[PDB]
Every structure is written in structure tokens, then in C-alpha cells.
Amino acid sequence: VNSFSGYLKLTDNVYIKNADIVEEAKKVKPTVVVNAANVYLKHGGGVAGALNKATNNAMQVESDDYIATNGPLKVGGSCVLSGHNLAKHCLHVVGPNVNKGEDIQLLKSAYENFNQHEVLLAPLLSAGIFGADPIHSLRVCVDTVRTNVYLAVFDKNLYDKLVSSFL
């Protein structure tokens, strides 16, 4: 039993809700919140900008030190950093950016990172400015993640569309 509330069960292990991931994190304080990151951990907009803003830029400061030490992430890769005031940990996951020409097959690799964590609060990867088809991303999530994932989709119209189209 956990403290997530109001989610639609999609499968044994995948849940979805029309909500701002930042507000879900503030409410639940999950062990792991997933950030929809880029390879440079530059948290400019979307989920990343919103999470970072909610940490008063502490996420960005930590991320800049990470990159200075380790270099960029791979597309499809991830790193575990602090969750600051929002969660115990933040799993920064890089989905492919189809507008950069990046291989959509890497979306499956991106979701595989979730399997290293028993429970996660997460956004829909490669949605928004990364340009992937959100229905496909949800299908990849359900077909790839085996651990318990609570998906927060802030855009109401998108949430409604994903729920009615799921195959």
C-alpha cells in the first residue's frame, strides 16, 4: 500500500492520472520521481524545468556538478541524483528527441531504466517538446516497465486522449 490517490489502473503495474508531477511529488514525497531529462541535464522547460524550479534551482546546481564530473548521459540512459524537497531520489531519464533525429527505438531503452526501482512517480517520456507520439510512448511504457509506475500527465486533453485510445 502507498499514498498515491486517484489513479486509473492501466495494467498490473502501470497507473495514470491527469496531474502535475510536481504537485504529485510535493503531496506524496515518493522514493523516486522521474525527470524527463536531456543528456546535458539542462532543466529548461517541461517536466525538467518545473521540477527544477520547485527545487529553487538546487536540482540544476547538483546536475551541473554531475556533468562536470561524468560528462553527458546517453540518449536512453539515466542517472540517480537527489530528489531534493520533492522525493528521496530523482531518476533523470533521457528519452529520444524525435526533433533532433534521435531513434524512437531508444524510448524502450529509456523506460528500461525504470525497472531498477520498485516504485516510481513518472512523466510520459518523450512527450511534449521531444515530439514522440504519446500513445506510442504509453504503449512502450506498459510493454517495458515491470515495476510499479505512477504516471502523472498534466495536460488534461492528452490524458483524456490516452485513456480512450489505449490498446
Ligand X SMILES: O[C@H]1CC[C@H]2CCN(c3ncnc4[nH]ccc34)[C@H]21
- Give me the residues that bind ligand X (CB under 6 A), please: 20-22, 46-47, 50, 123-124, 127-128, 152-155, 158
Q: How near is the Cβ of 65 to ligand X at its closest, in Å? A: 24
Report long-range pairs for 100-107 (Cβ below 8 Å, ≥24 apart): 102/75, 103/75, 104/132, 104/136, 106/75, 106/76, 107/76, 107/132, 107/136, 107/137, 107/140
C-alpha cell at 98: 524525435
Q: Which is nearer to ligand X, 69 or 164 (CB)?
A: 164
Q: Which is nearer to ligand X, 57 or 70 (CB)?
A: 57
Tell me how far apart the terminal alpha carbons of the chain are, to the nearest angstrom.
27
- Distance in angstroms (rounded) separating the CA atoms of residues 33 and 36: 10
Q: How near is the Cβ of 129 to ligand X at its closest, in Å? A: 7
Q: How near is the Cβ of 153 to ligand X at its closest, in Å? A: 5
Q: Which is nearer to ligand X, 69 or 92 (CB)?
A: 92
Q: How near is the Cβ of 138 to ligand X at its closest, in Å? A: 11
CB-neighbour burial class of residue 157 (10 A; exposed 0-12, middle 13-18, buried 19+): exposed
- Distance in angstroms (rounded) separating the CA atoms of residues 4 and 19: 12
Q: How near is the Cβ of 48 to ligand X at its closest, in Å? A: 9
C-beta nearest to ligand X: residue:
128
Q: Which is nearer to ligand X, 70 or 85 (CB)?
A: 85
Please identify which residue in the block is written with the cell numbers 508531477. Answer: 21
Q: Which is nearer to ligand X, 71 or 165 (CB)?
A: 165
- Distance in angstroms (rounded) separating the CA atoms of residues 159 and 80: 27
